Symmetry: C2
Subunit: 338 residues, 2 copies
């Protein structure tokens, strides 16, 4: 019932080049903090984000995804002519029409057989994109797929910061919009393939999803604004994950001790610590880049997986859980055997 | 001689289908009256909406209707058509161009409105006017595998804002001829919504079967039509030329995998961008225009909802019979072209 012949041929990530530290942001927001009587460092100390990266001026989501895709093609040692499907999974998008995938695909020079489209599902979309690609691979529709994701937070920072340094900004608004300053830029891409083409490549098994769509108002993001009930998002997200983990026990045969790495989408340091404690996950098996890069939306999971690969942390046979709670609320859990 | 499936979908059916027509009519005559001083300044003497593009009216929602609201209205009607409750739905995919937010998916909001169960998988697909077909295929792969029993594919489009802002821009005393021509196709869009319930065929033995189909792309043309919530710029001339070239490629694939010959299909449900573009398409492939229902004249171009709205109207009008082979065809910005078959 799980995927039998679906592999990961290549994986890459791109770190955005400009550092914006929380110290620097705080220097700018300090007058407003004081007026609200905030007092704590809600970014560095509470959320646990000390920096994030921003792109150069005028870098679009498609530019970032293209850079990651070129690097993933090199990692897979294949040319773009082999790609039969390119799915863009980012929250950021160039336009409503056409798909950002078509723009990345044009940049890369895909063939006329290549099917492309975007999937949107907040932070879980890269996993959805992997599942969608796996189903096509398993059925023999394509041999290789690219799943790409470029996130830009430049505008949300610029706008939120303006809309927070106006003296006349208010306090409900303030806490509602704080989570926007935990976002970061970055990009990732993955080449997936039919297993008989790539012996020795990691195997993607697929996984489980549960949802709690009654909570779809808890985090609403646009190009220039994100509004988020952080507290409620944490509790309801972890309750949802409890259902999903029960599901994963049954269909994936999961037991926490037997998994070798947990690659977890991160919203905040406390959210992550709550999640880890809830499931009794060894925190050593959880790589985190949130402190320096913040929340890179649906690129977070593959950027961390790529970093684990580049560091030499993954060995043959390792059982790797990809986990995340996405705005929706949705929770997806999936396995890769390295 | 043993033959394979050609990777077409097996045992996937259409259990229910519905559309919503938006309530307010905006005529091209009214639009022309507003644009008249600009037409006169630019020397435009023909009715480029009514006579050239072939659109006499389009429907609009109220200002406060979101994509998710339109989609939910369609989904409720589709569930009734399938005679199933929302608790049977294991997948819901929203395919619209219009979006409530970047995050979360419009799908999650439609799903919350409808009250889907905690087993329901949801997400959005975006692919300009072909996304509903992408949605059907994604759902089909899951239903064929037997992972779910029923899926909803939903799409609500709202063009209110693009009308309001485009008309403001085009009535500016300073609008240039170039920007006027660039924005003109935005005045051919319309609001509306569609939804479809798909199911494993074992559950609905006498329902229409969805076979899937083929796609080809020409992504070097991804700049030809670009749209955001308040503006759409379109190179209509090149969309015509490159779109037809791409459809010819896709038609070759459809012959090979679907075994299509135009004379053997009973209906063609074609995504429409304009009357002359449709006429060129039909003429290019030798399609019988009597088998092509059009709503463009009175509803305009409803984006990815166009194909399912027209299929739903065909069903409602009593134009579809058991055994009819229905071609779903379209060229969408990208450029992409997809061709798929439903056997009624």
């Amino acid at each position: 019932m799980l995927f039998q012949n679906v592999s990961i041929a290549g994986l890459a990530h791109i770190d955005a080049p400009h550092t914006l530290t929380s110290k620097e942001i705080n220097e700018r927001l300090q007058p407003t903090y004081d007026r609200l009587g905030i007092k704590t460092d809600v970014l560095g100390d509470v959320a646990g984000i000390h920096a994030r990266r921003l792109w150069d001026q005028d870098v679009q989501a498609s530019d970032a995804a293209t850079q990651a895709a070129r690097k993933a093609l090199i990692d897979a040692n294949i040319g773009i002519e082999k790609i039969g499907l390119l799915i863009n999974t980012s929250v950021s998008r160039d336009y409503l029409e056409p798909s950002t995938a078509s723009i990345v695909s044009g940049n890369l020079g895909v063939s006329d057989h290549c099917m492309t489209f975007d999937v949107a599902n907040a932070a879980l979309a890269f996993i959805n994109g992997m599942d969608i690609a796996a189903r096509m691979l398993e059925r023999g529709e394509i041999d290789y797929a690219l799943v790409v994701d470029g996130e830009t937070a430049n505008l949300v920072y610029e706008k939120t910061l303006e809309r927070m340094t106006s003296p006349d900004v208010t306090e409900e608004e303030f806490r509602n919009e704080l989570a926007a300053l935990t976002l970061g830029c970055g990009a990732a891409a993955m080449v997936m393939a039919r297993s008989e083409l790539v012996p020795d490549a990691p195997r993607y098994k697929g996984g489980v999803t549960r949802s709690a769509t009654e909570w779809n108002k808890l985090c609403r993001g646009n190009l220039d604004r994100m509004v988020t009930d952080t507290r409620l998002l944490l509790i309801e997200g972890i309750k949802l994950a409890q259902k999903t983990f029960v599901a994963a026990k049954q269909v994936l045969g999961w037991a926490v001790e037997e998994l070798d790495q947990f690659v977890i989408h991160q919203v905040s340091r406390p959210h992550t610590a709550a999640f880890v404690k809830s499931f009794g996950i060894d925190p050593a098996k959880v790589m985190t880049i949130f402190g320096e890069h913040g929340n890179i939306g649906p690129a977070s999971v593959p950027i961390v997986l790529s970093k684990l690969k580049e560091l030499g942390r993954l060995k043959k046979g390792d059982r790797i859980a990809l986990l995340g709670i996405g705005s929706g609320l949705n929770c997806s859990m999936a396995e890769v055997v390295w």
